[PDB]
Structure 1
Amino acid sequence: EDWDLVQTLGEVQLAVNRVTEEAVAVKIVDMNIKKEICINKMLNHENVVKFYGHRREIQYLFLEYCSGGELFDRIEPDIGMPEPDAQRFFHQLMAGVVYLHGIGITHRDIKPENLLLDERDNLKISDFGLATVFRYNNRERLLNKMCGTLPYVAPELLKRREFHAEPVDVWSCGIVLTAMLAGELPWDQPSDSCQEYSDWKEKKTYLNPWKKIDSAPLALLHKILVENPSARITIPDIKKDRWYNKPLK
């Protein structure tokens, strides 16, 4: 029953059980947090950070501990990571996202800061403070709230009053893939005012980060980073992508 607050992780602390020595993460929030707990209660997947419980003393959330830390730290600046590790993390990111979308949940803030790694280096999607329901009773609800982080955010979120939830997450996963591959973020935001975004739209891939990316992965990125959320590739189709299914190492 008794957990020692060993150290601060993120506030968030690592907790080690007094008897077991088991490690768990405790998110400390002094009074969005009611919804974060609700959503956590629905989630069970090996690519999502497991929820253990909560106690209302200041609110305390008990979350799986990931020794590996954030994926952000596995990306070398201006370099990225070896293509096979990227693909592996991407396969796990996809499995995690498929799951969430299956139980009608959208994370809404997918970035390497929120993708934790366990001891086996297995990816876990983390932090559902911005997540919301986009399907209930088999009924889809369009989203209108602006959420996320600007480099990661999809273009429709900027230019449209309402948008579908799933293509938004798919876009951020592609930005994440781009970061793993090139060790850099392509633009500050996906807007025409942004010069870098325009260059991509114009297909100038001889520029960075795209120049650092092999043709097979890049072909997938062309499918993912499509301005029209209706034309954008969907997850079931990412699954059929050649690079996605390319044996690596």
Structure 2
Amino acid sequence: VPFVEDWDLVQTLGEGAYGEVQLAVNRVTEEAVAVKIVDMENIKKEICINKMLNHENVVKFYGHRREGNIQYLFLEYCSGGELFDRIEPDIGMPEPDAQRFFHQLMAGVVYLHGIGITHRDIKPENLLLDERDNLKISDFGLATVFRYNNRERLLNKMCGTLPYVAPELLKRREFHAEPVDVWSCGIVLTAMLAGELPWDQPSDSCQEYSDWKEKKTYLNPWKKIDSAPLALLHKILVENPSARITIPDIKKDRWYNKPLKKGAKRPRVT
């Protein structure tokens, strides 16, 4: 009972705008959590969205505490770090690992879309890994409700990260939320398989993007990707968001359902 509420801040996990993420260890139990420290409406929405979240591939929210002009968000600690540091530059990672991470990303995104939430900034920096390398979607600072009382709200706000944003966000005034997150998942899949981003932004003025629309797959990063995951990327990275593949159909794709990876190495004797 005494001192069970005391947490020691032992190391900086992440820094940026606006604030830092610190690893916190409980004085009594030694339980590890991540404390998001935001130096104070945007944070009020983040807390509200985080309270709704309960899924094995979404970073858990334990609660928050306001100490004057500072908000403390208590969130799941993921010891495996970011997916970003598992991607070898210009190489990627083994195809079975990327497939497993992509299945977990799809389970997380299905869950969020199912409760009417769009993340809007899916990228490897935001995809965290637990001790068993289970992928968790993190940072709901740009997230929003796109479906309320079974009525879909079209989005118009410009946000995300240019190499991961869908082309409609740059060409159209209004757009559906769900195909935007599907596109960013395809850029994450491209990053995991080739270890590089295909373009700075998806616009006609961008040569790499024009080459993709012209199906010049003999060029990088596409030439490093096998034909089965590349056929899936041809369905995701579709300019027209109405023709773009939906997640129920991604789950029926040949590469998505290809047996590739063995389960976690279990102790055995002969």
TM range (shorter): over 0.9
Where in structure 1 are there 5+ consecutive unaligned residues?
Answer: none
Note the C-alpha offset of 1:82: 0.1
Query: Cα deviations across residues 153-181 of structure 1 (Å, max 9, x unaligned)?
Result: 00000000000000000000000000000
Distance in structure 1 (CA, Å) of the matches to 2:154 and 2:101: 29
Distance in structure 2 (CA, Å) of the matches to 1:181 and 1:63: 30
Distance in structure 1 (CA, Å) of the matches to 2:191 and 2:93: 9
Query: Cα deviations across residues 86-109 of structure 1 (Å, max 9, x unaligned)?
Result: 000000000000000000000000
Query: Cα deviations across residues 123-179 of structure 1 (Å, max 9, x unaligned)?
Result: 000000000000000000000000100000000000000000000000000000000
Distance in structure 1 (CA, Å) of the matches to 2:107 and 2:215: 29
Distance in structure 1 (CA, Å) of the matches to 2:57 and 2:7: 25
Note the C-alpha offset of 1:117: 0.2
Note the C-alpha offset of 1:184: 0.2
Distance in structure 2 (CA, Å) of the matches to 1:149 and 1:242: 29
Distance in structure 1 (CA, Å) of the matches to 2:227 and 2:31: 44
SS at match of 1:7: strand
Match of 1:91 in 2: 103
Matches within 5 A, 1:137-152: 137-152=149-164
| 1:22 aligned onto 2:34 | no
Match of 1:7 in 2: 11
Distance in structure 1 (CA, Å) of the matches to 2:90 and 2:140: 29
Query: Cα deviations across residues 57-105 of structure 1 (Å, max 9, x unaligned)?
Result: 1000000000000000000000000000000000000000000000000
Query: Cα deviations across residues 200-219 of structure 1 (Å, max 9, x unaligned)?
Result: 00000000000000000000
Match of 1:237 in 2: 249
Note the C-alpha offset of 1:244: 0.1
Note the C-alpha offset of 1:227: 0.1
Distance in structure 1 (CA, Å) of the matches to 2:32 and 2:168: 40
Matches within 5 A, 1:7-86: 7-9=11-13, 11-31=20-40, 32-57=42-67, 58-86=70-98
Alignment identity in percent? Answer: 100
SS at match of 2:105: helix
SS at match of 1:181: helix
Note the C-alpha offset of 1:4: 0.4
Runs of 4+ in 1 over 6 A off after TM superposition: none
Note the C-alpha offset of 1:54: 0.1
Note the C-alpha offset of 1:13: 0.2
Where in structure 2 are there 5+ consecutive unaligned residues?
Answer: 14-18, 261-270
SS at match of 2:141: coil
Superposed CA RMSD in Å reads 0.6
Note the C-alpha offset of 1:42: 0.3
Note the C-alpha offset of 1:41: 0.4
SS at match of 2:163: coil
SS at match of 1:61: strand
SS at match of 2:79: coil
SS at match of 2:58: coil
Which entry has the higher C-alpha Rg, 1 or 2?
Answer: 2
Distance in structure 2 (CA, Å) of the matches to 1:147 and 1:235: 22
